[PDB]
Amino acid sequence: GPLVPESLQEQIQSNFIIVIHPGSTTLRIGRATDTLPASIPHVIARRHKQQGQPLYKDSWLLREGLNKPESNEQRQNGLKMVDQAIWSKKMSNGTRRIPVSPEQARSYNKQMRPAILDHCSGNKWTNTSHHPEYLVGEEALYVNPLDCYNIHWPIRRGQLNIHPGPGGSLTAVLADIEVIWSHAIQKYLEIPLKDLKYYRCILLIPDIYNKQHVKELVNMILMKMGFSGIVVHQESVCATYGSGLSSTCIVDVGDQKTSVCCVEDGVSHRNTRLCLAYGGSDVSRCFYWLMQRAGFPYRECQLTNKMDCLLLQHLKETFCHLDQDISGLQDHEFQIRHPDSPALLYQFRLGDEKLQAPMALFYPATFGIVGQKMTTLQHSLFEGKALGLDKAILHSIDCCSSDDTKKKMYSSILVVGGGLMFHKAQEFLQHRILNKMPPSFRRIIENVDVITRPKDMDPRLIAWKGGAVLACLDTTQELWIYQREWQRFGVRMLRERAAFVW
Numbered sequence: 001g002p003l004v005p006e007s008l009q010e011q012i013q014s015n016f017i018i019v020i021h022p023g024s025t026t027l028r029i030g031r032a033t034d035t036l037p038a039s040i041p042h043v044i045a046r047r048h049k050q051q052g053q054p055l056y057k058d059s060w061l062l063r064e065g066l067n068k069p070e071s072n073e074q075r076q077n078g079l080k081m082v083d084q085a086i087w088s089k090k091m092s093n094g095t096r097r098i099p100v101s102p103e104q105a106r107s108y109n110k111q112m113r114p115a116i117l118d119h120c121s122g123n124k125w126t127n128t129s130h131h132p133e134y135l136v137g138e139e140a141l142y143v144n145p146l147d148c149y150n151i152h153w154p155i156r157r158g159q160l161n162i163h164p165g166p167g168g169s170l171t172a173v174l175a176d177i178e179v180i181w182s183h184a185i186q187k188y189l190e191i192p193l194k195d196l197k198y199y200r201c202i203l204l205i206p207d208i209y210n211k212q213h214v215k216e217l218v219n220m221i222l223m224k225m226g227f228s229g230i231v232v233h234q235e236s237v238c239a240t241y242g243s244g245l246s247s248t249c250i251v252d253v254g255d256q257k258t259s260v261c262c263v264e265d266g267v268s269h270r271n272t273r274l275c276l277a278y279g280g281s282d283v284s285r286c287f288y289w290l291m292q293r294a295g296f297p298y299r300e301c302q303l304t305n306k307m308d309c310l311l312l313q314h315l316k317e318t319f320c321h322l323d324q325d326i327s328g329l330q331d332h333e334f335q336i337r338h339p340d341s342p343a344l345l346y347q348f349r350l351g352d353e354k355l356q357a358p359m360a361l362f363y364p365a366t367f368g369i370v371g372q373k374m375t376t377l378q379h380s381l382f383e384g385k386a387l388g389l390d391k392a393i394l395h396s397i398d399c400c401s402s403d404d405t406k407k408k409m410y411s412s413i414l415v416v417g418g419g420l421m422f423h424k425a426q427e428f429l430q431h432r433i434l435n436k437m438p439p440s441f442r443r444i445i446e447n448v449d450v451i452t453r454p455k456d457m458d459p460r461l462i463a464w465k466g467g468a469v470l471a472c473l474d475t476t477q478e479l480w481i482y483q484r485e486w487q488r489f490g491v492r493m494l495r496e497r498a499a500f501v502w
């Protein structure tokens with residue numbers, strides 16, 4: 001409650017604490033005093049050192065296992081489960097939702113031609129005339145695909161993006177992280193790197209984390225970048241802080257990973273931890289596939305193409321919904337303003353695809369991913385099969401030992417991150433939870449409450465905000481690990497001094 005005059009707010013403690021929340025697609029970074037953190041595409045373009053090197057592009061909306069022999073059938077059967085769930089749920093007036101045909105749409109759609117809004121789109125490729133060794137964030141996304149740059153996303157599906165080839169070693173990934181993080185600090189926080197010695201860092205990490213990798217990051221923060229101290233915490237607990245819910249089931253739907261777990265007073269219960277290998281991006285790809293069947297008028301779209309991918313993400317965020325009551329064929333329009341093209345405006349007609357795609361989050365077989373580990377527990381048949389979001393929430397809560405805990409968890413489900421930012425998502429999910437949960441508890445419990453915009457904030461920023469909040473906490477004074485303790489004892493510090501059980 002200490003209100004600080006503007007003449008002094010650059011001198012309070014939290015002005016010298018940098019809060020860092022990495023993501024597969026977006027880095028969120030800022031001073032603990034910033035109201036909004038900077039949001040950067042967590043990506044880097046690196047120049048070739050020679051002529052005639054093959055262009056490496058990281059996968060984004062594509063991933064392994066989409067084209068196995070079984071992929072197409074699995075996709076089909078999932079979409080039938082989605083459809084069954086859609087039909088099964090009556091509309092507000094109590095009637096059935098009348099399905100509309102993809103073919104009916106296709107007929108109208110591929111008579112559609114784009115109009116031009118402008119001769120030039122108004123966007124251009126990042127300029128690389130001066131041969132930068134690298135580019136970061138949005139500048140990286142806008143590198144002409146024909147330029148001699150490899151594109152690297154240091155994080156995929158919420159873990160370090162290690163893979164065969166250039167940029168895929170642990171060391172390359174760490175160097176890319178450092179370059180990306182350092183660039184953001186100088187450019188957006190406007191903090192010279194030589195000054196980091198006066199700063200401390202709060203690093204948010206996944207609920208289920210990799211000890212070795214966290215170790216490395218901490219080493220990077222303290223030793224390579226020059227922060228004097230650091231505090232590491234799980235993004236799930238931070239989410240609870242940012243939202244003000246001491247006890248709650250937390251679900252973080254990101255672009256590529258979905259976390260579920262139960263948190264009780266700053267503690268994520270290991271036995272309740274689940275990580276699912278899908279998120280917003282999978283929905284984006286699915287929506288694309290559905291739209292193609294409806295005669296999607298942009299016919300030269302490709303999933304391997306960054307600009308197209310931004311378009312698909314955007315289309316999903318504009319059209320997709322989880323509202324039973326929005327039905328029928330609707331007339332829509334969208335723009336394309338890519339570099340090297342005109343500003344284009346497209347008419348087209350969409351039906352159930354707008355609802356089917358987001359619901360694949362509850363029927364993830366729809367993604368048609370075959371032969372991959374899809375589910376992860378904290379230190380198998382259950383892993384290779386993808387688990388719907390609601391089943392995961394339930395399963396997680398069911399892994400609480402106490403029943404008073406469970407009462408608390410069913411009663412409060414917090415949903416965080418961007419992945420589930422669809423219209424009516426809160427209601428939609430609250431409805432499934434009621435019907436799907438154990439009926440014994442459904443009675444004992446006054447209501448199931450799903451929270452999506454707590455305090456009416458941006459779900460993408462809740463955890464980051466919690467990180468800042470964590471810096472103000474009294475118990476936090478004892479969490480800091482400082483450079484010299486690290487240089488000396490290293491990993492021993494985390495075992496001794498981590499807020500969570502290392």
Ligand SMILES: Nc1ncnc2c1ncn2[C@@H]1O[C@H](COP(=O)(O)OP(=O)(O)OP(=O)(O)O)[C@@H](O)[C@H]1O
Pocket residue numbers: 022023024025026027157158253254255256257258279280281313316317318416417418419420421422460
């Ligand atoms: N209004 C919206 N409607 C639907 N989806 C949205 C909306 N806004 C953002 N998203 C989605 O949120 C996802 C990104 O969420 P977020 O930035 O929390 O992920 P991340 O932290 O980068 O990824 P991860 O947590 O998987 O590592 C993207 O798939 C994006 O399309």
Ligand SMILES: [Cl-]
Pocket residue numbers: 456457458461
């Ligand atoms: Cl906000």
Ligand SMILES: [Mg+2]
Pocket residue numbers: 022023024252254255417
């Ligand atoms: Mg995330």
